[PDB]
């Protein structure tokens, strides 16, 4: 028995969260972000071939893949293709990987549907617009419906669902994306993570993902900041940190080892799993990014000198786009011979070496009840205008649900939506749900403002 967000997943699935977390200490799995998709030495992909293969004579253990795929900017999604022709290539990659014997994980680089632009542009206030109650949250909802089709693509071909490791909304603590701290308050990223779990288990059935959560990195081991976007115990199955750099330092090895130990840490006492979700040389290791000495060794040296630090199951660096950026190295780059290096090293795990991950028989604990007020989220500035709180209380029957608004100047009796949330009329600080549900009174709140 483990304690995994979708109560309802998949033999398999339980099985994975069970391998990711006794594989911690134990030996930490590589990955490479379109292992097989993206190379330089591999020629024209086809979900086969990898750079990794190729200089280090094995596939990744983890193959890394992003949503960008379903938008046709990330191979082999097409941008002729439609929408649900890259689905299909993705899943098709998706069993290839799953065949060579490795570990799926993906990530979403998710377009700024308000603007028409991508992931990096930031504005047109995008994060807001998409959370419950916003003018583009259809848009978010036809884009995880997409993904939700990918789940269910993603089949062996005695039709077993392939696990996934989920990877949304990523790194937030910075503003390089539309959905990061300067575009949100930590209460509406939350709203957005929770409600992205909850649409695609509990309203699309999703049941083949484990969701994992990576708000940055540079934390300097704070568990209080780094947590300050945490979605919460029910929605989170992987803790992750993204963190390159491009010095070597002892300095940024220090750092590292930090953050390292804590997520370890915070994992262990959640009875939950742990990874270095992102790493590698800044700007990547080529043409246009770095050959800082020994790299990938030092910072392998620096994670199992550390018993604690050393406890996370994977590492995956990025994509192997072109020359200028790829940070997996290839003849000609510096670090090649660091990199074979680190390859070798008995601690890195490799796809041939995994083995029992998809076939253990773990049971999955009771989905933990929950509720948390959706709209609106904690943080958020309310307009004048007339807008409808909705509640969301989940692993256990609701009989009824309350809202009071203190400042008590409201007191809402919520109705459900028969679909996902409680809801209710509000005209307009402190709003407080409290659901009577079958285990027991659940109440939260969330501090708002008008304008
Ligand atoms: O423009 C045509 C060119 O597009 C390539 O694919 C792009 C992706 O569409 C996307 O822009 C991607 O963004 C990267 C970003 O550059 C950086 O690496 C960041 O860390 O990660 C994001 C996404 O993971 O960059 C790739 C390539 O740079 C590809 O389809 C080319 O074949 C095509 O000609
Ligand atoms: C490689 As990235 C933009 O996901 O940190």
């Not at 509640?391 to 809402?412: I, K, N, P, W």
């Given at each position: 028995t483990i304690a995994i967000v979708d109560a309802d997943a998949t033999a398999e699935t339980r099985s994975l969260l069970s391998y990711l977390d006794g594989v911690r200490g134990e030996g930490i799995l590589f990955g490479h972000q379109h292992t097989t998709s993206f190379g330089l030495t591999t020629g024209p992909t086809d979900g086969t071939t990898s750079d990794v293969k190729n200089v280090t004579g094995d596939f990744p253990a983890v193959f890394g893949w992003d949503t960008l795929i379903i938008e046709g900017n990330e191979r082999p999604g097409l941008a002729e293709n439609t929408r649900d022709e890259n689905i299909a290539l993705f899943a098709d990659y998706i069993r290839k990987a799953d065949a060579i014997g490795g570990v799926n994980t993906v990530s979403a680089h998710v377009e700024n549907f308000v603007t028409g632009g991508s992931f990096y542009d930031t504005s047109g206030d995008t994060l807001r617009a998409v959370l419950p109650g916003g003018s583009h949250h259809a848009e978010l909802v036809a884009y995880l419906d997409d993904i939700a089709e990918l789940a269910d693509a993603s089949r062996r071909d005695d039709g077993t669902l392939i696990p996934i490791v989920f990877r949304p909304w990523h790194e937030n603590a910075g503003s390089w994306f539309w959905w990061g701290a300067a575009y949100g308050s930590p209460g509406e990223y939350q709203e957005l993570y929770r409600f992205t779990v909850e649409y695609l288990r509990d309203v699309k059935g999703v049941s083949n993902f484990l969701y994992a959560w990576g708000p940055g990195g540079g934390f300097g081991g704070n568990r209080d900041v780094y947590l300050r976007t945490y979605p919460g115990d029910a929605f989170v199955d992987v803790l992750g940190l993204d963190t390159y750099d491009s010095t070597g330092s002892?300095?940024?090895?220090?750092?590292?080892?930090?953050?390292?130990?804590?997520?370890?840490?915070?994992?262990?006492?959640?009875?939950?799993?742990?990874?270095?979700?992102?790493?590698?040389?800044?700007?990547?290791?080529?043409?246009?990014?770095?050959?800082?000495?020994?790299?990938?060794?030092?910072?392998?040296?620096?994670?199992?000198?550390?018993?604690?630090?050393?406890?996370?199951?994977?590492?995956?660096?990025?994509?192997?786009?072109?020359?200028?950026?790829?940070?997996?190295?290839?003849?000609?780059?510096?670090?090649?011979?660091?990199?074979?290096?680190?390859?070798?090293?008995?601690?890195?795990?490799?796809?041939?070496?995994?083995?029992?991950?998809?076939?253990?028989?773990?049971?999955?604990?009771?989905?933990?009840?929950?509720?948390?007020?959706?709209?609106?989220?904690?943080?958020?500035?309310?307009?004048?205008?007339?807008?409808?709180?909705?509640?969301?209380?989940?692993?256990?029957?609701?009989?009824?649900?309350?809202?009071?608004?203190?400042?008590?100047?409201?007191?809402?009796?919520?109705?459900?939506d028969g679909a996902l949330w409680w809801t209710a009329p509000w005209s307009p600080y402190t709003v407080t749900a409290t659901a009577t549900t079958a285990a027991g009174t659940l109440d939260v709140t969330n501090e708002v403002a008008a304008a």
């Open positions: 002892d300095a940024f090895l220090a750092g590292l080892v930090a953050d390292l130990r804590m997520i370890a840490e915070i994992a262990d006492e959640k009875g939950k799993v742990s990874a270095f979700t992102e790493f590698g040389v800044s700007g990547g290791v080529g043409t246009n990014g770095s050959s800082p000495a020994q790299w990938f060794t030092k910072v392998l040296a620096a994670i199992k000198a550390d018993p604690v630090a050393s406890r996370n199951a994977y590492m995956e660096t990025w994509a192997n786009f072109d020359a200028g950026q790829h940070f997996v190295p290839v003849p000609g780059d510096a670090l090649l011979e660091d990199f074979q290096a680190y390859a070798a090293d008995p601690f890195t795990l490799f796809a041939s070496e995994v083995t029992g991950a998809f076939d253990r028989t773990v049971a999955a604990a009771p989905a933990q009840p929950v509720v948390h007020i959706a709209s609106p989220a904690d943080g958020a500035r309310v307009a004048s205008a007339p807008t409808t709180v909705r509640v969301r209380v989940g692993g256990t029957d609701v009989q009824s649900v309350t809202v009071e608004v203190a400042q008590v100047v409201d007191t809402l009796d919520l109705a459900y």
